[PDB]
Structure formats: C-alpha cells, structure tokens
Symmetry: C4
C-alpha cells in the first residue's frame, strides 16, 4: 500500500507550488 500521509504531503506541496506560480503569472 501507500502511506496516506505521504500522499497528503504531496497534494499540499503540489497545490502550494501551483497556486504560487499561477499567482505570480
């Protein structure tokens, strides 16, 4: 299986990066 906390970590990090890039652009 996969750790649900690591998936959550990825989701949070990906969203933060995406929202920040779109904010700047």
């Amino acid at each position: 299986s996969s750790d649900p906390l690591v998936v959550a970590a990825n989701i949070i990090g990906i969203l933060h990066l995406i929202l920040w890039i779109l904010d700047r652009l």
Copy 2:
C-alpha cells in the same frame, strides 16, 4: 501507526500554504 516525521511534514506544508493564502488575501 503513523510516522511522526511525515506528520510533521504535513503540518509544516499546510501551515505554510494557509499562511501564504491568508497573506495574499
């Protein structure tokens, strides 16, 4: 039995995301 390291990572990432959103708003 969750990994505290991974829990810490989620707390940091989520706090950072929330603090950044609220600052931009």
Copy 3:
C-alpha cells in the same frame, strides 16, 4: 528501495523553494 512518494515530496519542495528564492532575488 525508497518510497517514490517521498522522493516526489522532496522534488516538489526543493523546486518550490528554489523557484521562490530565484524569484525574490
């Protein structure tokens, strides 16, 4: 082996940190 999801977490985090530093400077 290493968890691919933890590898993705590092890649995302360090990319975000690098892009933000570069943006600011």
Copy 4:
C-alpha cells in the same frame, strides 16, 4: 531508524516556511 528522505522533506519545508516568514516580516 528514520527515513532520511523524510528528514530532508522536513528540512526543506521548514527552511522554506522560515525564509518566507522572515522575508515578509
């Protein structure tokens, strides 16, 4: 033992959060 890839994830996120706060403050 602790997973070093998870330690690094915490170090990156913590550094990034701190740098961003200090930059805003």
